Amino acid sequence: GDIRDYNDADMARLLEQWEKDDDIEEGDLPEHKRPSAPIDFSKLDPGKPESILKMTKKGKTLMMFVTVSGNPTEKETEEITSLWQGSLFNANYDVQRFIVGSDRAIFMLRDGSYAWEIKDFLVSQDRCAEVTLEGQMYPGK
């Protein structure tokens, strides 16, 4: 306590957060104790994001908009998409495929793991074609 100015000013500005806590607390004791009896929850923290399982539900309407032809004749898209419908199902890849938009073949996946795998199979053709995802195109990270 050799200098008032620095102490009160700077130290209060530093302790401001602590004083704020004390001020909003006002020393009122709540009946609410730590509800977690097994500290092991915060001790270990399982890491398993169960939230995803709680957030997920059946009804994966995620499709890939595959602009195959680019030519008015819907035939081309139907032919190639039915060929894919063959090969995929023959490869045990049971997926949903519809032709809405003469050029746009939509592949709706009930799965996800092999999303880029089937996508690869699609773009594996010389033409490549436009294969977009409903919404955004995210591989994962």
CATH of 1-28, one of 6.10.250.640, 3.20.10.10, 1.10.3720.10, 3.30.43.10: 6.10.250.640
Query: CA 107 to CA 104: how far, in whole Å?
Result: 10
- CATH 3.30.70.260 placement within the chain: 62-135
Q: Which CATH class is domain 62-135?
A: alpha beta
- Retrieve residue 51's tokens: 């939230």
Query: CA 88 to CA 108: how far, in whole Å?
Result: 13
Method: NMR
Q: Which own/partner pairs from 73-82 qualify as long-range (CB within 8 Å, at least 24 positions apart)?
A: 73/102, 74/99, 74/102, 77/102, 77/103, 77/104, 77/105, 80/105, 81/105
- CATH 6.10.250.640 placement within the chain: 1-28
For residue 8, give the 3-state DSSP assignment.
helix
